[PDB]
Design a protein around this ligand. Sequence first.
Ligand SMILES: *C/C=C(C)/C=C/C=C(C)/C=C/C1=C(C)CCCC1(C)C
Ligand SMILES: *C/C=C(C)/C=C/C=C(C)/C=C/C1=C(C)CCCC1(C)C
Ligand SMILES: *C/C=C(C)/C=C/C=C(C)/C=C/C1=C(C)CCCC1(C)C
Ligand SMILES: [K+]
Ligand SMILES: [K+]
Ligand SMILES: [K+]
Ligand SMILES: [K+]
Ligand SMILES: [K+]
Ligand SMILES: [K+]
Ligand SMILES: [K+]
Ligand SMILES: [K+]
Ligand SMILES: [K+]
Ligand SMILES: [K+]
Ligand SMILES: [K+]
Ligand SMILES: [K+]
Ligand SMILES: [K+]
Ligand SMILES: [K+]
Ligand SMILES: [K+]
Lengths: 262, 262, 262
Amino acid sequence: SECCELCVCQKEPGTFGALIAVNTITAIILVAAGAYMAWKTAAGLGWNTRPHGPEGPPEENWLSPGISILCGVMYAFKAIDWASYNDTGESTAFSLNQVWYSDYLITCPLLVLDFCITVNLRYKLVFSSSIACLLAIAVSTFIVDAPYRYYMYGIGLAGFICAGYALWNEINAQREKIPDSAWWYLSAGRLIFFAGWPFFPLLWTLSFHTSGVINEEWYFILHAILDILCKAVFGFFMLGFRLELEELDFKAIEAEQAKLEG
Amino acid sequence: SECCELCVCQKEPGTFGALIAVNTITAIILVAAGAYMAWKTAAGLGWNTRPHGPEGPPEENWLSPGISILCGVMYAFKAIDWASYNDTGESTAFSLNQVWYSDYLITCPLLVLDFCITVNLRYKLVFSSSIACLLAIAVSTFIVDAPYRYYMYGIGLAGFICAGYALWNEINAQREKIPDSAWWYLSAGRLIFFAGWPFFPLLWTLSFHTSGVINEEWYFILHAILDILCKAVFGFFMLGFRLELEELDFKAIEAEQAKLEG
Amino acid sequence: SECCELCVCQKEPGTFGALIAVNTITAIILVAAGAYMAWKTAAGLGWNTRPHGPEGPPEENWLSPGISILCGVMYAFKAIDWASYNDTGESTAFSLNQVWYSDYLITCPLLVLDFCITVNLRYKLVFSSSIACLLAIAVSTFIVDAPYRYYMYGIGLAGFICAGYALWNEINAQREKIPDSAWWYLSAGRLIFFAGWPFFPLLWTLSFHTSGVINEEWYFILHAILDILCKAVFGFFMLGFRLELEELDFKAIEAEQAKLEG
Ligand SMILES: *C/C=C(C)/C=C/C=C(C)/C=C/C1=C(C)CCCC1(C)C
Ligand SMILES: *C/C=C(C)/C=C/C=C(C)/C=C/C1=C(C)CCCC1(C)C
Ligand SMILES: *C/C=C(C)/C=C/C=C(C)/C=C/C1=C(C)CCCC1(C)C
Ligand SMILES: [K+]
Ligand SMILES: [K+]
Ligand SMILES: [K+]
Ligand SMILES: [K+]
Ligand SMILES: [K+]
Ligand SMILES: [K+]
Ligand SMILES: [K+]
Ligand SMILES: [K+]
Ligand SMILES: [K+]
Ligand SMILES: [K+]
Ligand SMILES: [K+]
Ligand SMILES: [K+]
Ligand SMILES: [K+]
Ligand SMILES: [K+]
Ligand SMILES: [K+]
């Protein structure tokens, strides 16, 4: 039928509790992580919350909490949607669970931008737009029928590997500048970027529409954990990196000022 | 049926004259207001149209006329759409009247940005993106079915109140800088922002889909007046503010130059 | 029926080879042109590929290759879509051939921006957003029914003529600055802009939905050539302009430095 054997549209009303629970929990996690990040950025500069200043926190210091909070709002909307599936058995009109990877568009162009701004990686906009385009091909690979979904997957994967290589090069060409104390958080966010991301593309090969190992319910459940790790946990490592940099900057400024007085 | 009792889809062909008229009138108003604003910005700097310069009017001086003109084009498209409902009785393919608050997305992210640029309010992009996201929840609250539209409304209203509080704080933390002559126009645009906006959210509670006091025809008619007051009249007050600032700046420059010669 | 007499939906499975071929060829052309442009921008500054520097190529030097490559990816997706029409006889779920001029949105706001950045034309964002809005009216004129498609066409054409006039003025008010060596490429990209663009609007008058001279198959075939000329060939002239400017800049810097040493 319209709903494939392994879809959430074949599940009966009353059997969606797991999905609502997972999505509410992730909404809370993402929103609260983003709120901690927001508090940390507002409260102060470095690890010891040094008073910001007249201009306040930079506007890019809000990109990171921003994504986490927005993804949490998205997940709350998804859980509201899943609750309609539990009752009416037929979703909402505004379902963020209908189009797969449609929310990942926004989130990704915002995260790659974050990384590229914080680490001062070059071609910030280039990278961010490339990822938006590769995550538009991702949506397509879920909608487009069999033979052509694999052709589209090929294009998307080629570009993903190309952009990944270029990104790797950029981070490794900024390693010299990045202090060793701040590199821990960077390498952790990179690890999240090079392992965690390829996971999204490989889970495709075992998905409900491709193979059929993971049914749509469980695919959705797994993409929630992956979002906690991207979005939320990526931002906590990037927040850490930022704070380390800002504490080291405070230290450097204070030392420069000591030498200025002396 | 698909069309609720109090909808424009239940109205017979030939009974849409009022809607076409209102929407054409508002199109004219918004476009002409934006054109006056455009002329004023191009012609000169302050109230006495002081010759601009080599670079010309700043690109942000076009955000304000821009929105008004675009909303007027939107309303012209809406009136064309309403004319098809008057004749064919079944709308156009490209109807800006189908999805409610879908046009408000663009207009709002552009207006909050305007305010934040002109008054130099901090977190410009943050505020503008927050409003875009809260006006995406607004569209949802019109499409999503009963129980879940109120859950979504709750999220949207929470964020609206949060962003409103934050905005209020920002404007009041910039009051010291803003000259008293320019504050008149600011307080008027703020009044339009804190009263006029909450009106949009409260009319929801009495709308065709929520309660049923205001049928979709009249809801549409009221949202046209509200757009004249937001968009058009908001920009005339903001244009006024800008011009006041620019005239005071011209005065300050001329005084500084007199002291430079002396 | 839903498909008009002169549409690609009336063509039988197996008769789409021409469309696939044209769209694959254009995909290759656009991608390869954009890749040459990308190589040229990365490799060096001017015509003689002068080593760039620490910061590398400006982020706007990627807007031009970018569009060409993205339009090539779009056309590859279109050819994949056309192959489904050749086999299944009913398109893909993600068809870039469904909505007419929907891809032109992105491409156009990116190209006008390019021109305005490279030639330092004023009102860059204004122009780019105007074109995005006029190319949203373009999509409408393909979907909206008879009487109202001509009303929308009128609005779109009025704005197109207005923006065209304003653009002409801007380029002619920057002619004095632009060196004569670089003007060749500029006038060629302008020629592509003032002739080539009006072609898009005039082909509308003879299209499958308006008149019926050009059926949708051949309209699609012609819009592919027009994209090679816009996108691809526009960027090769703009790449040329950029390179000329950069070689002249290198020359000027080297002369200034000779005088600095002397
Ligand atoms: C926070 C959101 C994330 C990390 C989403 C990432 C999405 C991708 C890395 C998409 C990957 C792809 C697919 C699974 C579909 C098409 C092929 C790829 C590789 C672009
Ligand atoms: C110029 C356009 C304007 C002023 C539109 C504003 C729209 C809102 C303030 C939306 C308000 C909300 C709803 C009516 C729906 C969801 C809840 C709110 C408060 C976000
Ligand atoms: C690279 C993409 C290009 C050059 C697309 C350009 C599209 C236009 C110039 C659209 C023109 C118009 C229509 C054919 C429909 C509505 C009326 C116009 C003039 C805006
Ligand atoms: K901070
Ligand atoms: K950042
Ligand atoms: K998300
Ligand atoms: K989804
Ligand atoms: K994050
Ligand atoms: K002005
Ligand atoms: K402004
Ligand atoms: K509007
Ligand atoms: K509407
Ligand atoms: K306005
Ligand atoms: K270059
Ligand atoms: K450029
Ligand atoms: K294209
Ligand atoms: K098309
Ligand atoms: K190009």
